[PDB]
Design a protein around this motif. Sequence first.
Motif, PDB file in Angstrom:
ATOM      1  N   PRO A 242     -10.279 -50.992   5.774  1.00  0.00           N
ATOM      2  CA  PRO A 242     -10.450 -52.149   4.888  1.00  0.00           C
ATOM      3  C   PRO A 242      -9.212 -53.014   4.724  1.00  0.00           C
ATOM      4  O   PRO A 242      -9.338 -54.141   4.228  1.00  0.00           O
ATOM      5  CB  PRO A 242     -10.838 -51.503   3.557  1.00  0.00           C
ATOM      6  CG  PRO A 242     -10.153 -50.203   3.573  1.00  0.00           C
ATOM      7  CD  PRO A 242     -10.083 -49.752   5.005  1.00  0.00           C
ATOM      8  N   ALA A 243      -8.034 -52.541   5.115  1.00  0.00           N
ATOM      9  CA  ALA A 243      -6.809 -53.296   4.892  1.00  0.00           C
ATOM     10  C   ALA A 243      -5.727 -52.777   5.828  1.00  0.00           C
ATOM     11  O   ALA A 243      -5.923 -51.804   6.562  1.00  0.00           O
ATOM     12  CB  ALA A 243      -6.371 -53.204   3.432  1.00  0.00           C
ATOM     13  N   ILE A 244      -4.576 -53.446   5.795  1.00  0.00           N
ATOM     14  CA  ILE A 244      -3.432 -53.121   6.638  1.00  0.00           C
ATOM     15  C   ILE A 244      -2.173 -53.189   5.787  1.00  0.00           C
ATOM     16  O   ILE A 244      -1.984 -54.136   5.018  1.00  0.00           O
ATOM     17  CB  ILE A 244      -3.306 -54.081   7.839  1.00  0.00           C
ATOM     18  CG1 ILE A 244      -4.570 -54.087   8.707  1.00  0.00           C
ATOM     19  CG2 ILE A 244      -2.094 -53.725   8.668  1.00  0.00           C
ATOM     20  CD1 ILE A 244      -4.840 -52.809   9.460  1.00  0.00           C
ATOM     21  N   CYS A 245      -1.309 -52.187   5.935  1.00  0.00           N
ATOM     22  CA  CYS A 245      -0.010 -52.154   5.275  1.00  0.00           C
ATOM     23  C   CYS A 245       1.060 -52.534   6.288  1.00  0.00           C
ATOM     24  O   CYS A 245       1.270 -51.817   7.272  1.00  0.00           O
ATOM     25  CB  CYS A 245       0.274 -50.772   4.692  1.00  0.00           C
ATOM     26  SG  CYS A 245       1.601 -50.746   3.471  1.00  0.00           S
TER      27      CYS A 245
ATOM     28  N   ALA B  10      -0.442 -55.311   1.200  1.00  0.00           N
ATOM     29  CA  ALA B  10      -1.757 -55.038   1.762  1.00  0.00           C
ATOM     30  C   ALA B  10      -2.393 -56.340   2.222  1.00  0.00           C
ATOM     31  O   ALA B  10      -2.541 -57.278   1.431  1.00  0.00           O
ATOM     32  CB  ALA B  10      -2.649 -54.347   0.734  1.00  0.00           C
ATOM     33  N   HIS B  11      -2.771 -56.389   3.495  1.00  0.00           N
ATOM     34  CA  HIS B  11      -3.348 -57.575   4.111  1.00  0.00           C
ATOM     35  C   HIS B  11      -4.840 -57.355   4.308  1.00  0.00           C
ATOM     36  O   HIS B  11      -5.244 -56.462   5.060  1.00  0.00           O
ATOM     37  CB  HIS B  11      -2.675 -57.881   5.448  1.00  0.00           C
ATOM     38  CG  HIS B  11      -1.215 -58.184   5.339  1.00  0.00           C
ATOM     39  ND1 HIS B  11      -0.699 -59.444   5.541  1.00  0.00           N
ATOM     40  CD2 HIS B  11      -0.157 -57.386   5.059  1.00  0.00           C
ATOM     41  CE1 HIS B  11       0.612 -59.412   5.386  1.00  0.00           C
ATOM     42  NE2 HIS B  11       0.966 -58.175   5.092  1.00  0.00           N
ATOM     43  N   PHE B  12      -5.646 -58.161   3.633  1.00  0.00           N
ATOM     44  CA  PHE B  12      -7.089 -58.173   3.789  1.00  0.00           C
ATOM     45  C   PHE B  12      -7.501 -59.296   4.728  1.00  0.00           C
ATOM     46  O   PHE B  12      -6.762 -60.267   4.904  1.00  0.00           O
ATOM     47  CB  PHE B  12      -7.771 -58.364   2.434  1.00  0.00           C
ATOM     48  CG  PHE B  12      -7.503 -57.262   1.456  1.00  0.00           C
ATOM     49  CD1 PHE B  12      -6.391 -57.298   0.639  1.00  0.00           C
ATOM     50  CD2 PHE B  12      -8.368 -56.194   1.348  1.00  0.00           C
ATOM     51  CE1 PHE B  12      -6.146 -56.288  -0.260  1.00  0.00           C
ATOM     52  CE2 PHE B  12      -8.126 -55.182   0.450  1.00  0.00           C
ATOM     53  CZ  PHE B  12      -7.014 -55.230  -0.355  1.00  0.00           C
TER      54      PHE B  12
ATOM     55  N   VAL C  95      -3.218 -61.718   1.537  1.00  0.00           N
ATOM     56  CA  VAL C  95      -2.380 -60.699   0.915  1.00  0.00           C
ATOM     57  C   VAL C  95      -2.726 -60.599  -0.560  1.00  0.00           C
ATOM     58  O   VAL C  95      -2.902 -61.616  -1.242  1.00  0.00           O
ATOM     59  CB  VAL C  95      -0.885 -61.014   1.107  1.00  0.00           C
ATOM     60  CG1 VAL C  95      -0.039 -59.982   0.384  1.00  0.00           C
ATOM     61  CG2 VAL C  95      -0.539 -61.054   2.582  1.00  0.00           C
ATOM     62  N   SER C  96      -2.825 -59.369  -1.057  1.00  0.00           N
ATOM     63  CA  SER C  96      -3.080 -59.138  -2.475  1.00  0.00           C
ATOM     64  C   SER C  96      -2.637 -57.729  -2.827  1.00  0.00           C
ATOM     65  O   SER C  96      -3.262 -56.758  -2.392  1.00  0.00           O
ATOM     66  CB  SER C  96      -4.556 -59.333  -2.798  1.00  0.00           C
ATOM     67  OG  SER C  96      -4.767 -59.395  -4.197  1.00  0.00           O
TER      68      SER C  96
ATOM     69  N   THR D 260       1.121 -53.436  12.127  1.00  0.00           N
ATOM     70  CA  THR D 260       1.927 -54.645  12.163  1.00  0.00           C
ATOM     71  C   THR D 260       1.062 -55.884  11.971  1.00  0.00           C
ATOM     72  O   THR D 260      -0.123 -55.898  12.313  1.00  0.00           O
ATOM     73  CB  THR D 260       2.675 -54.744  13.493  1.00  0.00           C
ATOM     74  OG1 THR D 260       3.269 -53.478  13.805  1.00  0.00           O
ATOM     75  CG2 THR D 260       3.758 -55.809  13.433  1.00  0.00           C
ATOM     76  N   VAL D 261       1.676 -56.925  11.415  1.00  0.00           N
ATOM     77  CA  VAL D 261       1.061 -58.238  11.266  1.00  0.00           C
ATOM     78  C   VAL D 261       1.980 -59.264  11.908  1.00  0.00           C
ATOM     79  O   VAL D 261       3.197 -59.244  11.692  1.00  0.00           O
ATOM     80  CB  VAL D 261       0.800 -58.587   9.788  1.00  0.00           C
ATOM     81  CG1 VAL D 261       0.295 -60.008   9.667  1.00  0.00           C
ATOM     82  CG2 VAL D 261      -0.196 -57.619   9.179  1.00  0.00           C
ATOM     83  N   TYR D 262       1.395 -60.163  12.692  1.00  0.00           N
ATOM     84  CA  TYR D 262       2.152 -61.145  13.455  1.00  0.00           C
ATOM     85  C   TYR D 262       2.371 -62.410  12.639  1.00  0.00           C
ATOM     86  O   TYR D 262       1.482 -62.855  11.909  1.00  0.00           O
ATOM     87  CB  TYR D 262       1.420 -61.479  14.753  1.00  0.00           C
ATOM     88  CG  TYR D 262       2.098 -62.530  15.597  1.00  0.00           C
ATOM     89  CD1 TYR D 262       3.254 -62.240  16.303  1.00  0.00           C
ATOM     90  CD2 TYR D 262       1.577 -63.812  15.692  1.00  0.00           C
ATOM     91  CE1 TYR D 262       3.875 -63.197  17.077  1.00  0.00           C
ATOM     92  CE2 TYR D 262       2.190 -64.776  16.464  1.00  0.00           C
ATOM     93  CZ  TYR D 262       3.339 -64.463  17.154  1.00  0.00           C
ATOM     94  OH  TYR D 262       3.954 -65.422  17.925  1.00  0.00           O
TER      95      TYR D 262
END
Lengths: 40, 49, 49, 48, 128
Positions: free
Chosen positions: E60-63, E68-70, E103-104, E117-119
């Motif tokens: 459901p999300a990424i750290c 936390a990136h939704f 992000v939230s 990872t997030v680009y």
Amino acid sequence: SQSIIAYTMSLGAENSVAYSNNSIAIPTNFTISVTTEILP
Amino acid sequence: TSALLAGTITSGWTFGAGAALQIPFAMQMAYRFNGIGVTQNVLYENQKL
Amino acid sequence: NTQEVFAQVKQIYKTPPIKDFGGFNFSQILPDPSKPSKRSFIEDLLFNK
Amino acid sequence: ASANLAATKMSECVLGQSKRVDFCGKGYHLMSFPQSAPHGVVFLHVTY
Amino acid sequence: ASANLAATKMSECVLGQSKRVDFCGKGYHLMSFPQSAPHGVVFLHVTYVPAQEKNFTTAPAICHDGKAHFPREGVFVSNGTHWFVTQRNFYEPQIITTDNTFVSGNCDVVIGIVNNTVYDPLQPELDS
């Protein structure tokens, strides 16, 4: 060798689909359907 | 009645259109919350409530 | 009138033994496999009322 | 007419998410769970 | 009652696109074409039906760095080694970025979250 029979009706085939907290099924292709509906 | 529960609990709104679709239940509510003008944040932040 | 209501599906679905749904308890609506009739608690109340 | 209505609710409320007001319960409809009954049917709606 | 229904379907199905399920055909409704008949009418309901599936691992999300990136519109999937974002009803995988996500909060409250990872498209231009 045929004859008339009697039986209990079946409600279709069982489908115990997969399950997990970390599983998802996504479509890859698609199919266009054109059905029919009659109304007096 | 039991078959339609197992599809809604599992696939949500997909089995009514075609083949069933494995989706987790917590993710279904995230999309249903988006269907009413509410983000996915409040669900996972309040998943226990 | 029943087929148009209840027979909205073409294949029977079933729940898994591992009922992990993120904290939601559907026991009172899912069927009791122990009873002779495989109807839930809430269904049994309505048939008695 | 009641049966045709219930058949419409199972498609809209149960098999999908309805944006129609007070058609699948008071509030913003999330999902619905059906239950059988003698000579009828019962819906357990879920609303925000 | 059958005529009032057909009048309701000619408005919702033909004259417009309906989000109502099983009202304008089985599946996701695109458009419908009417045809006449003796003492009645015939509707040809065009529908979109997903056919070929593929099991994937989700989350459901990424750290990324504590945040936390939704996803804005889509779901996170995985081929076992890399994570992507894709539309729900069609497999169109693409790289996770800050434009495809929202992000939230932090990573200590969401259940099932995973680290990845997030680009950021701004970073390589700085090195230019």
